[PDB]
Every structure is written in C-alpha cells, then in structure tokens.
Amino acid sequence: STTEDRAKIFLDNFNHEAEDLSYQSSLASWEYNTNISDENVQKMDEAGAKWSAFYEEQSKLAKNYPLEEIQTVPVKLQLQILQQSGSPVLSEDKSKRLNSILNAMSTIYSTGKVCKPNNPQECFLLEPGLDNIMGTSKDYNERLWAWEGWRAEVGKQLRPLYEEYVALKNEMARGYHYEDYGDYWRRDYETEESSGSGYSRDQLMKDVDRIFTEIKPLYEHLHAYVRTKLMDTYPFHISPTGCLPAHLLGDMWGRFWTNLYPLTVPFGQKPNIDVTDAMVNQGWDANRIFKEAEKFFVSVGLPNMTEGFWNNSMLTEPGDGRKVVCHPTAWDLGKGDFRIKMCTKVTMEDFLTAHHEMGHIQYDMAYATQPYLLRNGANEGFHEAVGEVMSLSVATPKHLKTMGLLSPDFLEDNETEINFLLKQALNIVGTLPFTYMLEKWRWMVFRGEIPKEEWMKKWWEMKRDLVGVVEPVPHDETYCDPASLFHVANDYSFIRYYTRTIFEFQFHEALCRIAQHDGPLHKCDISNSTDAGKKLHQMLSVGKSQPWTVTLKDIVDSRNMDVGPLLRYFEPLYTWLQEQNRKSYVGWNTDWSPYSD
Amino acid sequence: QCVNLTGRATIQPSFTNSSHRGVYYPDTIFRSNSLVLSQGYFLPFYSNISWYYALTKTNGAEKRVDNPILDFKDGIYFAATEKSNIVRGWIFGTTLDNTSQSLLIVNNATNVIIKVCNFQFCYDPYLSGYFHNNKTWSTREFAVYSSYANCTFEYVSKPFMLDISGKSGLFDTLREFVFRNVDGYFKIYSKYSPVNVNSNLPSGFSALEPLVELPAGINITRFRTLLTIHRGDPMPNNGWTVFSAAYYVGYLAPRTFMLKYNENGTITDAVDCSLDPLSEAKCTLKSFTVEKGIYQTSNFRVQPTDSIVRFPNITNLCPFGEVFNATTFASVYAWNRKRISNCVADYSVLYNSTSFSTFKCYGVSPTKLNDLCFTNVYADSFVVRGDEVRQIAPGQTGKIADYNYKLPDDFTGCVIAWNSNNLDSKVGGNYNYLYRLFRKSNLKPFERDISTEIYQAGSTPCNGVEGFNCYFPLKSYGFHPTNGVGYQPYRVVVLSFELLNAPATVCGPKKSTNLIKNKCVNFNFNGLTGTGVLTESNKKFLPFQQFGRDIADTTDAVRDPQTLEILDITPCSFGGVSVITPGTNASNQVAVLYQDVNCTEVPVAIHADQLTPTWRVYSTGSNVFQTRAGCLIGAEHVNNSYECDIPIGAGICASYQTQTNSRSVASQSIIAYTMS
Ligand SMILES: *[C@@H]1O[C@H](CO)[C@@H](O[C@@H]2O[C@H](CO)[C@@H](O)[C@H](O)[C@H]2NC(C)=O)[C@H](O)[C@H]1NC(C)=O
Ligand SMILES: *[C@@H]1O[C@H](CO)[C@@H](O[C@@H]2O[C@H](CO)[C@@H](O)[C@H](O)[C@H]2NC(C)=O)[C@H](O)[C@H]1NC(C)=O
Ligand SMILES: *[C@@H]1O[C@H](CO)[C@@H](O)[C@H](O)[C@H]1NC(C)=O
Ligand SMILES: *[C@@H]1O[C@H](CO)[C@@H](O)[C@H](O)[C@H]1NC(C)=O
Ligand SMILES: *[C@@H]1O[C@H](CO)[C@@H](O)[C@H](O)[C@H]1NC(C)=O
Ligand SMILES: *[C@@H]1O[C@H](CO)[C@@H](O)[C@H](O)[C@H]1NC(C)=O
Ligand SMILES: *[C@@H]1O[C@H](CO)[C@@H](O)[C@H](O)[C@H]1NC(C)=O
C-alpha cells in the first residue's frame, strides 16, 4: 500500500486516543468551568498540558505524511487541520509567558469592579453586578462614572500586556505559515480548488467587506432611529446627524443593544413579546425551557436530549456552592456526552441563548459520527449559526402562541411584527458593525500596519466610520478600550459572530424555503417541519469533513455568502425605517463629539 | 341395582354418514381471518357415525334404550339432540366405575350445572316425565340418578335457555355438539337451533359456534349414554317407554380442518383434510375453492396422531445465570468461549427480560429456538459500544467485525446485547476493556486475536515501540458513567448456536413425552419436527450421531437419547400425489395419486385401513387406476382415449368431461376419457 492508507490508519489511531483522553480533558475543563476550587487548578493543569502534549506530538509525527499524496478529501482536510496546527514556534519561556498572559487576562477581567471613591469597598462585579448599570439605570452621570472607571480598571493593567500579547500572537502565527494572527484566525474558512474553488482568506476579506457594504444602510437607518428615540429620553447628548455616545448603549462596552428595546419600541403600549412574568407564574424553569427546546427539536426532526444531558450538565447554581463563571457555553466533550452551562434566567435573550447552545448541541450530535479532528463546526461561523437560527425561529411570536408560551389575546398585526423585528434588529444588526469593526481592527492590529501609538485613534475612528459610535473620552493610548470585552480578554475569534449572523439568515432563508412556511421570514417558525429539519441535518452532518462552501452550496444552492437574506428578513422593517427617519437624516457625522461639544 | 329387563336391545349400530356436520371453532376471539390448516382433535367428515334409533312406533319398534360401550379416545361428536327434551343428561365416566370420575352433561334448560363429583352407579340410570301444566311434563322424576359428593370439579351458573316443549316434526333439531376435555379446556360447543328433516343426519353446513370453556381438564378415554323412558304417558299403554328419538354417536380423531375465521371465527366451507382427495386438495390450496386441473395435495391423508418429542433427560441448570449476571468482564479482543456443555437452558426467557437491548438473531428466531435444540453452543461474552453493537451483526463489517470478533454470514444462532451502565463505568474512566482497531487483514469468523503485536504499519521495524509510523492496536474503550448512549458500556453475549449430526447437548425446557409404539405421529425428538410412523427398525446407523438423512434429507433415523435406541421414521403417507381431475364442477367424485408403490399396499403400508368410509368407497375398495407416475384408487380404466392436450389429468387423458348426457343419475365423473 501507499502512504494514504498509512495516513488513514494514523488518523484512525489519533481519533480514537483523541476521544479517549480528550474526553476527560474536556470533562475536567467542564469541572473547573462549573466549580472553582484549588484542586481543579491541577485539573486544568492536566486537562491542558497533557492534552496539548499528546495532540502536539501526534501532529508533530504527522509532519512526514504528505498532504498532496492524499486522494481522500476528508482525510485531506484532516491533514490540513492537524499538520497546519503544528508545533508552536515560540520557545518554552515565550509560550509559558503567553499562557501566563492569557491567565492574567482572564483573572483580571473576571474580577473587575467599578467602585465609588467615597465607598470603594461596596461595589459590584461586571456580571451580574455591572450589566444593569448600562441598562435601565437612568441619570447617566453614574453611567459615565462606571464607563470611565471600567475603562481605567481594564486599561491601567492591560494596555501594555495586550500590546505585547499582540506581538507574541503575531510571532506564533508567523511560524505557522500564516502572515499574521488574523490569518490564523481565518484559516478555518479554507477550501480547495476541486470543490470550494480555493477560497483563500483574501476571498474572506473581500467577502466580509462586500457583506458589510450593503448592511451599512440598514444599520444607518437603525442608528438614526435609535438617535431619534434617545433625543427625548436623553437631552442634547446626541447629535441629530452625528454619532451616538458609547457609554449609552444597551450593555457595557456597547456590545448588545438588548435593553435599548424598552427605550426604542415605537408602539409597545399594546401587549407584546415580553412573557417574563408569565415565565415566572407558569413554573417554566431552566429545565422546562429545555424540555420546550426538545419538543421544538423533535418537531423539526433533530435528535433529542440524551440521558447524560438529563443527569449531568447543570446550568445554574446547583445550591451546593459550585461557583461558576457562567457564560452561554455548549460542550462537545467528544465520544457521546454533551453539556450546557450558563446562569440560566427566564428572560427572552437568555431563552434564545438556551435554544442557541441547545442547537449547538444538536449540531455536535449531528456530526458526532465524524472523526474527532473533524468534530468541530463546518467553519467558525456555522457552529454558532445553527444554534442562532434555531433561537431565531423559536423566538417568533406565532411559535410562542402555538406551544402555549404567549398569551391567547396577542395580536399578529403589522406593528407588533415590526416591534419584534426591531428587537431582532437590535440584537443582531446593532452587533453586525460592532463585530465587523472589532474583527477588522484585530486584523489591522495583527497585520501590524498600525503601530501601538495609534491603535486607539484608529479604534475610535472606525467606531465613527463603520459602526458610527462616539465616546466621551478617547482615553488617549494609556487604556485598552477594545480589550474589556469577554471574547477579546480570553482571545476568542470574533469573526465567529459576524459570519454567524451572515449565515444566520441564509440558513433561515433555507428554513423558510424548504419548510415553505408563509410570511417573509418573520413569522416563519420552523417547528413541525421534518423535511427542512432533516435537510438541515445533512447540512450539519457533513460538518467540517466537506468544506463549508460546498455545504452552503448544498443548503441554499449558493456556494458563497450574501446579504440578500438580510433584505428578505428585514425589508418591512427597512421600508418602515425610511418612513420613520424621514424627519432625521440617515447616517452619522464624526464631527460631533461629547468631548468636542 | 338396575336389571336388564324387557325393552333392551343388542348393539345393532347404524353406521351411517357423518355428513358435513359438526365443526367447532377453536380460538373463540376473532383472528386475522387466515384460511390456514387447523390441526388437532377434530371430527371426521362423513365417517361411520353410529346412529341408534330409539323409536316407539310399535311397542318394541327396535327400541335403542340400550347402554352400549362407546370409546372416547380424543373426543366425541354427539348429536343426541331433540327439542322434545328426551334422553337429556349423560354420564361420561372415564371407565364408568366408582374409581372413574363422571363428567355429566346437561342439555336441558331447567338446571345448567356441570359437576363431576363421584357418581357411582349401576349399569342403567333412568329419567321420566308424566304431567305438568307448563309444557314441561315434570321432566325431573323421583329416582336415584346416582349421587354427588366431594366434587373435584364444579360449574354452577344460571339455568339458561337450551330447549323446551316438543319438536313440531320428526327431528326438528340442529343442536349438535362436540366434547373433548384437555389441558383445562372443555368444549361444550353447540349449535342450538331447529332444523327439520324426515329421518336422517342432515347435511347442513357445520358452523357450530363456541359456547363455553371449562377448566376441568380431566382425561376421558371411554364414556356411556343415558336414556329417559316416560312413565306417565309416552303412549296410552302407560308403560316405561322412551319417546320417538334418533340419536347419534361419533368420535373425534387427530386431523385437520380448513377454517376461514372471517367474521369472529365463522366459516364458509369447512373442509376436513382427511375426507377425500378433493378435501386434501382444498387443504393444500389454503383457500375455500377447488381449482381445475392436475393438482398435488399435502401429505395429510392420515394426520399425525400425537406430537411426540424426545429430548435428552438432562435436567441441568445452565451457566446462563452467570452469563447475563457475569462477573467475567472480557473485551472484544479477549472474547470468551464459555461452552455450556450438556444442559437445559431457559431459552427465550432472557428475551422476556425487559432490561435487555438487542436480541437480533439472524438465522434462528427466538420462538423456534425453544423447541429446536442445539448440538453445540458458545457464549461469546464481552464488551462493545453502541455503534459496535450495530457493528457486531454478521452482515456488517467494520473495526469491531473485520479487526475483531467476526461473525459468519449465516451463523445459525443469535446475539444479545444490553447496557452495562453503572456496571462497567468508572468515574475516572474504565480503561480496563480494550479493542484491536488494527490488523494486517480482516478476521475470519470466530478467530481469537490476543496478539498485541506492533502491527507493523508501513515498513517500520518497531520491535516494542510506537514510532511515527508504528501504532498500538490494543487500545482501550475509555468508558465513563457520564458518557453518552452511543459510547455507553454495552455487554454483549453472542449466543452462537450450531446443530450438527452430533447428539444434542443444551436444550429447551419441556417434558419429553413417552414414545409411541407404531402410529403416524408428529415426531419432534431433538427438535426435528416432521410426520411419520415411529418404528423400531434397525439400519446401518453410526451409534454416536442422531440426525439421519435417508434420501433427499428424508431423515428416517433418529436416536432416542434415553435408551440410546434408533427409532426410524417411516412416513404414514408418501408424496408424489396428483389429483387427476378435481371436483370444482359437477364431477363430485375424486381420486388422487398416492405412490409408485402399488395400491394394494395402501391399507397396510400407506395405512388407510382404519380411515373413514369415504376412503373406503373412494380410496380403499373402489376402482383402481395406474400410470407411469404411480397408482391411485377412485378412477377406473377405459379403452377409449384421444390426443392428450390440456394439462389436466397427469399423463393419461382425463379432464373435466361431462357424463350427464349419457345418464343424469350421477352427473359427471372422473373417467379418463380425454384431456379436453
Ligand atoms: C467542586 O469542584 C471539584 C472539582 O475540582 C469537585 O470535586 C471534588 O472537590 C472536593 C473539594 O472539596 C474534593 O474533596 C473531592 O475529592 C473532589 N471530587 C473528585 C475529585 O472526584 C466538587 O464536587 C465540586 N463541588 C461540589 C460541591 O460538587
Ligand atoms: C440476575 O440479575 C437479575 C437482575 O439484574 C435478577 O433479577 C431477575 O430475577 C428473575 C427471577 O426472580 C428473572 O426471571 C429475571 O430474568 C431477572 N432479571 C430481570 C432483568 O428481571 C436475577 O435474580 C439475578 N440472578 C441471579 C442468579 O443472581
Ligand atoms: C428521545 O426520543 C425518543 C423517541 O421518542 C424517546 O424514546 C426518548 O425517551 C427521548 N429521550 C429523552 C426525552 O430524553
Ligand atoms: C442522574 O442519575 C443519578 C443516579 O441514577 C442520580 O443520582 C442523579 O440525581 C440523576 N440526575 C438528575 C436526575 O438530574
Ligand atoms: C406543531 O408545533 C406546535 C408547537 O408550536 C405543537 O404544539 C403542535 O403539537 C405541533 N403539531 C401540530 C399538528 O400542530
Ligand atoms: C404596517 O402597519 C401599519 C399600522 O401600524 C399599517 O397601517 C400598515 O398598513 C402596515 N403595512 C402594510 C404594508 O400593511
Ligand atoms: C414473554 O414470554 C411469553 C411466554 O410466556 C411470550 O408469549 C411473549 O411473547 C414473551 N414476551 C415478548 C415481548 O415476546
């Protein structure tokens, strides 16, 4: 035999020991990530260094295997996962310095408290003690205080640490045959010329840019709408044609626009989507929310929850002091077990995160038949995209009424549908230019075309150019203004969310076309849709094994991404906005600033 | 205490035709209307039913008030029924003694109670009726009528309606019935309804419905009748005298019917298989309509009398208790071969266990593996995963079939698997079980591979190390109690069964009934089902082996495992049969081929000497025809023929010819004129 069979049996061996020991690696990761202790520190030590060591030595001995000799394209793509994620070119001192940097980031970001000067002892942590401060808390002088204090309390210890971290990650990606850290973050969207027509990462930059060009008008109309509705609530702090203040968004560091929805609904005086008190009185806890999720998933034609998914995978605090750094997190442990954690409340956005990571689990069981190195998302985007498509289809008020969630006397008129589309417009489109500018800023930084003295003056200028947000104090360069978000502290890839929202409405266009439900993707709930659900199931089951461009060509009959699903999802909202911001002007102006004015 | 005074008669039987009468419905609840064969104790059609006429036209009038000896064996058809409430009540003792248990039968509506008790009495009991103002004429009479005490079996209920008053005409009654008591089932199945004839057993359609089942089940081998002679006024001579009656006694034999079970067990054309060649042709057709042409019948001219089974007297408890509750925790590379040796196992009782996952068999179904029992057996107990349980099926090839325990493409056995959660799962990881995911080639079926070699992947001479191109095949499962159902610890036992000529070793739990001497029976032996006469004939048979073959797997010879004696099976009737011209049309007579053996051996070797009179006037004692394919009785030779064209009639010209034109007395026949 030739070396292709040798590579096949090597990947067989690697897959089976990878499941065998990465199962308890991910199990100890889950055990630390659900209970904080002192011996779970050594659990992290083993579940880190051990798995990293065996994975690295198994990839290192794979280097002699020629990629081009392989004729089997799943085996081929297995080699481009395994060999290209080879040995880190940093030294032992440099790599351990890098790991200490990551640990320092996570620890000092997870302990941040903005504290008043008169009583510095009594103050709140970021989650869930400071997320309310940027929300319903009016009289924004303390909002300004909390914003400035949080920016200082991340900046004074994480500006040069991030600056030096950038150099280490760029050096790490440089030895990985990639030009910069952005390129190693974009390597997940790589295909071949036989099936995916190559699709280099240059195609990724041009595709991301052409996606962003024609989502800019919709976001501009939304931003003008939000400006006009913050005029009356917030006097003179917003320019009529300028940008909007950064400290006055829905949450901290302007990530989501969720809690602006009570401040931005046009005619929400009528009964609307909010069901939270009915969630309280119906007895629908986190567990009952999950049973609702599996009725939705056996309705759509996806497998339900396993017995391990019953007994383990505790979401909230179990009442036993198991301290959790709770964030919406799914767990593909490998083998057969899959887990879910977050501080599961009963609110709308957390209900959609419950469906979101539940769809993550459905994704993970769907390609559970794949090899372990193929047992990931079809790219960085699909993996979140499937769960978010599930979360968006379950969120439709028609679905809420059908399965008894929503009140019987609810009205499905045009205006309440516009209000729901507005809530989705905040929770998605208020994040699209934010995530685009943040990931593009990461790409510029990792490319290194902007030196460290001008990262911030760049950061706040496409904050006024791509997402159209102004800030009260630019913090000069001594602080680390873009480094106070969760995914940037722990250094998660942030094009995941942008391409999640890109593929979100493409998959929802598929799940409104094959499911054939009426309504222009607004009330297009996908429940009791076996054919579209099973078509989505092959789209999940091919997974990473076949390149995601071919997967997109299979699901929506288009090998490339596009904006037009955003149009078919938001066109009555869009047409409403041109008949809503007719008084104001669509767009923003960088000239007006709260420090300048 | 009863003397045979004036009035009694001799045996003087009237061996008349049983007609198309007396078919009861087993399985009273409605079925899937299958027109399949119904085998068991059943009534012969048109047999020599003993009619005795207890009439009173004259003083004597050949009064059948006698009490004749009458054998029960495997059932009775009793049609001693008349609407005038005559001779009601009967005594059915096994030997008709004080030792024997008498199962009385009540055919009147005044007290429907069936009790066994003891009922010790003399040769003749009696009953009478003088006068009563409610058209009952005091049917209960002051007499002894035996006695009842310490009753082993009792049935008391409301005295529901059966019959009353008197018949308008001579035998205006169709209330026939059939009894046989077996295994807690008693048939009192009747057809209470009036139908009038002149004086005959009517040829009305046998469609008597089920009535009741009783849990008595006491064995009956003989019985007796009981009479009612009226004291008051049967005739104006005021003597003891039974009124005008004509009563019937027939017996049930092991045979087969064809029952539709269309609407709650009803039938359209009841066909007793051992009646005539038309009937056996109908039984083979599995329907209720005769075809037109040459036709081969099933081998049911005489049916098996008994279902004899002869298993080895083992009575051992198999180690299956420590197979499914096994502490032996193997792996798929170190798969066990726990031989069960010589024992009796509770086959398919583990299939009844609801805690078990996959009992797919692939070759021997769970039902037929209790009675067909096995020469050799192995356990093959080890551990696999859920996808590996899907893999362990014989037709599926993969890393647990090709590179581990492999099954043959037929396997003639079964495989069980179940969950061993909290049995083989360790919270830190249960790595103690292994598999071999690497081998130089696919494993042959039932090939053990403990060899933990370097696997020699590529051209690398490893010799004890796992290099860049060298890989360890003996790799662990890695179970966890939190692990998923597809990777859950599953215990599998591949219950490999095989049957050879060797004597049976582990068999299913049942009682081996005592062997018959010489009778066409349903032999089972060591699971070898079939039909034939058991004979003690000795042939050149190897002493150790038991499964004979004879010719074309006729398997004549089979060993009794107790006394180690050969017991040949010579079939009571042979194949090679052919209905020359059937009776769908008015050609009512019929004849089927029997054998290349001459028809003079039919009553003695094919054993038709004790059959119904239909097999006498149709098959043993009637016209004989012979062909190159053999011989038959029922058709006659003739010198006239023509070109043989139509496929009806085997080789010598015969078809659906008409004979009504010559004479209309008998209409068409089966004379071999011409293949039309
Ligand atoms: C807290 O997390 C730890 C994981 O590090 C869980 O494990 C136990 O931790 C305690 C510490 O008090 C040890 O004494 C036990 O030996 C650990 N069990 C093991 C290693 O199996 C612990 O269960 C978590 N806390 C709770 C309340 O569940
Ligand atoms: C073997 O273990 C089973 C339970 O795992 C025991 O339970 C049942 O016992 C009855 C008899 O009372 C059997 O008919 C069942 O088949 C058994 N199994 C199940 C699943 O119900 C059983 O008693 C144990 N046997 C021994 C010899 O220890
Ligand atoms: C998943 O669905 C199957 C099929 O209905 C069912 O047997 C099983 O119990 C379900 N599992 C759950 C609800 O955890
Ligand atoms: C899961 O099962 C175990 C044992 O069967 C039990 O102790 C545990 O509480 C269960 N977890 C649930 C029901 O969430
Ligand atoms: C359709 O889905 C709903 C959930 O929205 C569910 O309640 C219902 O049973 C499903 N089936 C039908 C026939 O409506
Ligand atoms: C949208 O809703 C408004 C009411 O708020 C209604 O007047 C209008 O007709 C709706 N648009 C369409 C296209 O029906
Ligand atoms: C359990 O055993 C009985 C025999 O008593 C059998 O009829 C039945 O089919 C068995 N159960 C199943 C599920 O097959």
Would residue A383 show up in a list of annotated catalytic residues for this protein? Answer: no
The C-alpha atoms of residue A184 and residue A347 are separated, in whole angstroms, by 37
B78 φ, ψ to 5°? -120, 120
Q: Which residue numbers of B have CB closer than 8 Å to A's CBs? A: 386, 399, 428-429, 431, 437-438, 457-458, 467-469, 471-472, 475-478, 480, 482-488
B429·A335 Cβ contact <8 A: no
Query: Cα dist. A485→A150, A152, A489, A593 in Å?
Result: 11, 14, 6, 23
- Which of the 8 DSSP states describes residue B503? P
Helix (H) or strand (E) run with residue B38 in it:
strand B37-42
What B149-154 contacts at long range (C-beta under 8 Å, 24+ apart), as own/partner pairs, is: B149/B117, B149/B118, B150/B117, B150/B118, B151/B115, B151/B116, B151/B117, B151/B118, B152/B101, B152/B116, B152/B117, B152/B218, B153/B103, B153/B115, B153/B116, B153/B214, B153/B215, B153/B216, B153/B218, B154/B114, B154/B115, B154/B116
Q: What are the sequence ranges of the domains in chain A? A: 1-87, 95-165, 276-411+497-546
Report which protein residue has its CA nearest ligand 1's atom 27: A320
Nearest CB among A9, A21, A337 relative to B482 is that of A337
Question: Under a CB-based contact definition with an 8 Å cutoff, are residues B279 and B252 in contact?
Answer: no
- Of B290, B300, B299, B285, residue with least CA distance to B590: B290
Does the residue B570 lie in any domain? Answer: no
Residue A414 near ligand 6, beta carbon < 6 Å: yes
The C-alpha atoms of residue A438 and residue A434 are separated, in whole angstroms, by 6
Strands A244-245 and A469-470: parallel
Q: What is the largest CA-CA distance in chain A?
A: 77
Residues framing ligand 3 (Cβ under 6 A): A 304-305
The C-alpha atoms of residue A428 and residue A432 are separated, in whole angstroms, by 6
- Which of the 8 DSSP states describes residue B661? T
What spacing in Å lies between the alpha carbon of A190 and ligand 2's midpoint?
57
Same domain, B59 and B152: yes
Q: CATH number of the domain at B473, please.
A: 3.30.70.1840
Same domain, B208 and B343: no
Nearest CB among B429, B438, B484 relative to A24 is that of B429
Given B476, B511, B546, the domain boundary residue is B511
- B142 burial type by CB count under 10 A (0-12 exposed, 13-18 middle, 19+ buried): exposed
Given B234, B252, B270, the domain boundary residue is B252
Question: Under a CB-based contact definition with an 8 Å cutoff, are residues B510 and B395 in contact?
Answer: no
A16·B429 Cβ contact <8 A: no
Q: According to the annotation, is A496 in a ligand binding site?
A: yes
CA-angle at B389, arms to A20 and B394, nearest 5°: 130
What A324-328 contacts at long range (C-beta under 8 Å, 24+ apart), as own/partner pairs, is: A324/A33, A324/A34, A324/A35, A324/A36, A325/A33, A325/A36, A325/A110, A326/A127, A327/A486, A328/A353, A328/A354, A328/A356, A328/A357
Question: Under a CB-based contact definition with an 8 Å cutoff, are residues B510 and B440 in contact?
Answer: no
B41 φ, ψ to 5°? -70, 115
Structure tokens at A226: 């939000």
Structure tokens at B417: 């698997």
Question: Under a CB-based contact definition with an 8 Å cutoff, are residues A475 and A483 in contact?
Answer: no
The C-alpha atoms of residue B564 and residue A217 are separated, in whole angstroms, by 98
The C-alpha atoms of residue B100 and residue B374 are separated, in whole angstroms, by 42
The C-alpha atoms of residue A426 and residue A223 are separated, in whole angstroms, by 10
Question: Under a CB-based contact definition with an 8 Å cutoff, are residues B633 and B620 in contact?
Answer: yes
Tell me how long chain B is: 676
Question: Under a CB-based contact definition with an 8 Å cutoff, are residues A128 and A343 in contact?
Answer: yes
The C-alpha atoms of residue B79 and residue B261 are separated, in whole angstroms, by 24
B326 φ, ψ to 5°? -90, 130
- Which of the 8 DSSP states describes residue B253? E
Does the residue B645 lie in any domain? Answer: no
Strands B593-595 and B630-633: antiparallel
Does the residue B338 lie in any domain? Answer: yes
Residues 6+ apart with CB under 8 A from A306: A336, A337, A338, A365, B484, B485
Residues 6+ apart with CB under 8 A from A256: A249, A250, A349, A426, A427, A430, A431
The C-alpha atoms of residue B528 and residue B368 are separated, in whole angstroms, by 11
Give the residues across from A340 on adjacent strands: A330
In the numeric block, the tokens 């009305």 are attached to B204
Q: CATH number of the domain at B192, please.
A: 2.60.120
Judging contacts by C-beta atoms under 8 Å, the chain A residues touching residue B472 are 13
User: According to the entry, how was the structure determined?
Assistant: cryo-EM
Does the residue B399 lie in any domain? Answer: yes
Same domain, B50 and B148: yes
Q: Answer positive or negative: Cα dihedral of B550, B553, B559, B560.
A: negative
Question: Under a CB-based contact definition with an 8 Å cutoff, are residues A280 and A354 in contact?
Answer: no
The C-alpha atoms of residue B355 and residue B490 are separated, in whole angstroms, by 12
B457·A20 Cβ contact <8 A: no
Strands B70-71 and B222-223: antiparallel
CA-angle at B91, arms to B88 and B96, nearest 5°: 155
Q: According to the annotation, is A65 in a ligand binding site?
A: no
Residues 6+ apart with CB under 8 A from A12: B399, B437, B438
A115 φ, ψ to 5°? -125, 135
Q: What single letter denotes the amino acid at residue B246?
A: A
Helix (H) or strand (E) run with residue A520 in it:
none
Range of the domain at B443: 312-511
- Of A4, A13, A20, A22, residue with least CA distance to A75: A4
- Of A57, A201, A90, residue with least CA distance to A495: A201
The C-alpha atoms of residue A234 and residue A212 are separated, in whole angstroms, by 30
Q: Answer positive or negative: Cα dihedral of B96, B101, B107, B108.
A: positive
Q: What single letter denotes the amino acid at residue A471?
A: E
What spacing in Å lies between the alpha carbon of B318 and ligand 7's midpoint?
21
Same domain, B236 and B156: yes
B60 φ, ψ to 5°? -80, -65
Q: According to the annotation, is A187 in a ligand binding site?
A: no
Domain count, chain B: 2
Start-to-end C-alpha separation, chain A: 76
B483·A64 Cβ contact <8 A: no
Tell me how long chain A is: 597
- Of A236, A237, A235, A228, residue with least CA distance to A260: A228
Query: Cα dist. B5→B2, B69, B91, B123, B238 in Å?
Result: 9, 18, 21, 12, 17
Residues 6+ apart with CB under 8 A from A203: none
What spacing in Å lies between the alpha carbon of A528 and ligand 5's midpoint?
6
Question: Under a CB-based contact definition with an 8 Å cutoff, are residues B413 and B364 in contact?
Answer: yes
The residue of chain B nearest to residue A28, with distances taken between CA atoms, is B428
Question: Under a CB-based contact definition with an 8 Å cutoff, are residues B202 and B16 in contact?
Answer: no
Resolution in A: 3.8
Question: Under a CB-based contact definition with an 8 Å cutoff, are residues B294 and B580 in contact?
Answer: yes
A190, A357, A417, A439: the catalytic one is A357
Same domain, B387 and B483: yes
Q: What single letter denotes the amino acid at residue A117?
A: P
Quick check: helix, strand or coil at residue B174? coil
HSE at residue B125, side-chain half, CA atoms within 13 A, is: 22
Query: Cα dist. A395→A8, A255, A388, A398 in Å?
Result: 44, 21, 10, 9
Count Cβ atoms below 10 Å from residue B140 Cβ, excluding itself: 14
Q: What secondary structure does DSSP assign to A412-478, as a single string?
A: --HHHHHHHHHHHIIIIITTHHHHHHHHHHHHHHHHT-S-GGGHHHHHHHHTTTTS-EE-S---TTT
**Residue A38 touches partner B, C-beta closer than 8 Å:** no
Given B200, B221, B252, the domain boundary residue is B252
The C-alpha atoms of residue A364 and residue B62 are separated, in whole angstroms, by 95
Same domain, B84 and B204: yes
Does the residue B583 lie in any domain? Answer: no
Count Cβ atoms below 10 Å from residue A260 Cβ, excluding itself: 22
Does the residue B103 lie in any domain? Answer: yes
Measured in angstroms, the CA of A61 and the nearest CA of chain B are apart by 5
Query: Cα dist. B546→A381, B169, B505, B552 in Å?
Result: 70, 64, 12, 17
The C-alpha atoms of residue B501 and residue B524 are separated, in whole angstroms, by 15
The C-alpha atoms of residue A33 and residue A191 are separated, in whole angstroms, by 34
User: Hey, of B390, B421, B482, B488, which one would you mutate to test binding to chain A, going by the most A CBs within 10 A of its CB?
Assistant: B482
CA-angle at B331, arms to B458 and A5, nearest 5°: 20
Give the residues across from B376 on adjacent strands: B498
Same domain, B336 and B468: yes
B625 φ, ψ to 5°? -120, 150
CA-angle at B500, arms to B496 and B501, nearest 5°: 160
Question: Under a CB-based contact definition with an 8 Å cutoff, are residues B591 and B633 in contact?
Answer: yes
The C-alpha atoms of residue A276 and residue A280 are separated, in whole angstroms, by 6
Residues 6+ apart with CB under 8 A from A193: none
Does the residue B384 lie in any domain? Answer: yes
The C-alpha atoms of residue B392 and residue B385 are separated, in whole angstroms, by 10
HSE at residue A20, side-chain half, CA atoms within 13 A, is: 18
Q: How far is CA B610 from the centre of its chain?
A: 21
Query: Cα dist. A184→A57, A177, A305, A428, B229 in Å?
Result: 20, 9, 34, 26, 114
Residue B234: cis peptide before it, omega within 30 degrees of 0: no
Q: What secondary structure does DSSP assign to B205-249, as a single string?
A: ---PPP----S-----SEE------BSS-SSTT--SB--SEEEEE
Nearest CB among B467, B471, B484 relative to A336 is that of B484
Residues 6+ apart with CB under 8 A from B435: B331, B332, B333, B384, B388, B399, B400, B404, B474, B475, B476, B477
Does the residue B607 lie in any domain? Answer: no
